[PDB]
Amino acid sequence: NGLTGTGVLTESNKKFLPFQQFGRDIADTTDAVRDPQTLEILDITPCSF
Amino acid sequence: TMYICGDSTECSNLLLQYGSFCTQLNRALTGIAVEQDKNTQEVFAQVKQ
Amino acid sequence: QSIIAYTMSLGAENSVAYSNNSIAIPTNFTISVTTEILPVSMTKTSVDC
Amino acid sequence: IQDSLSSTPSALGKLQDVVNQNAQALNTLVKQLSSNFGAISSVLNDIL
Ligand SMILES: *[C@@H]1O[C@H](CO)[C@@H](O[C@@H]2O[C@H](CO)[C@@H](O)[C@H](O)[C@H]2NC(C)=O)[C@H](O)[C@H]1NC(C)=O
Ligand SMILES: *[C@@H]1O[C@H](CO)[C@@H](O)[C@H](O)[C@H]1NC(C)=O
């Protein structure tokens, strides 16, 4: 949806509500996103450096 | 807020975008304020009776 | 229990009886241990610009 | 002294403070990462 970014993405376990699509850290950044094509839960983690 | 944009609504609005500078200063001035009482506490009250 | 305001007490008042031929010599003693705390270091931190 | 240290929490305030301020500055430093500073976005990938 225009949210360009870079990181390793894997299956999540954090419970999104049926209507939410973003999870934010205390530092105000998106660490979890919902796939729009199919409804699944994912992490967005920066690849190690 | 009072120093930078005293008694003006519009000026108090643009200062909001700069984040937490205003909070940072007020703690810094408070940090030395409490410390001053600690000094005169330390040098004069060596006797309690 | 409630909250009250008052003037602080400079301590427990105690007068001493001076004289030109009076002395006091202790006859007993106690060995008490008192703690003391001092910081010695902080958590090191590095930041990439 | 074992009871004095265990029962009261204010005894170790001096050591606790230096831990706190170090955590405070880092929190504020990363908090400024979300402020626009006068631009139209705080996300450097959005403008690009
Ligand atoms: C000096 O003081 C100590 C205590 O500070 C005295 O020791 C106590 O003596 C009483 C006798 O009435 C005992 O009941 C206590 O059990 C003792 N305390 C301890 C910790 O053993 C001591 O007798 C005093 N000595 C002099 C010469 O005054
Ligand atoms: C995209 O197409 C798939 C079929 O492969 C469908 O299951 C999915 O619901 C479509 N996307 C949306 C947002 O409906």
UniProtKB/Swiss-Prot annotation, chain B:
Name this protein carries in UniProt: Spike protein S2
Biological role stated in the UniProt entry: Precursor of the fusion protein processed in the biosynthesis of the S protein and the formation of virus particle. Mediates fusion of the virion and cellular membranes by functioning as a class I viral fusion protein. Contains two viral fusion peptides that are unmasked after cleavage. The S2/S2' cleavage occurs during virus entry at the cell membrane by host TMPRSS2 or during endocytosis by host CSTL.
Lineage: Viruses, Riboviria, Orthornavirae, Pisuviricota, Pisoniviricetes
Highest taxon in the source lineage: Viruses
Species, as recorded: Severe acute respiratory syndrome coronavirus 2 (2019-nCoV)
Consequence recorded when altering residue 26 to K: In strain: Omicron/BA.1, Omicron/BA.2, Omicron/BA.2.12.1, Omicron/BA.2.75, Omicron/BA.4, Omicron/BA.5, Omicron/BQ.1.1, Omicron/XBB.1.5, Omicron/EG.5.1
Disulfide-bond pairs as recorded: 5-11
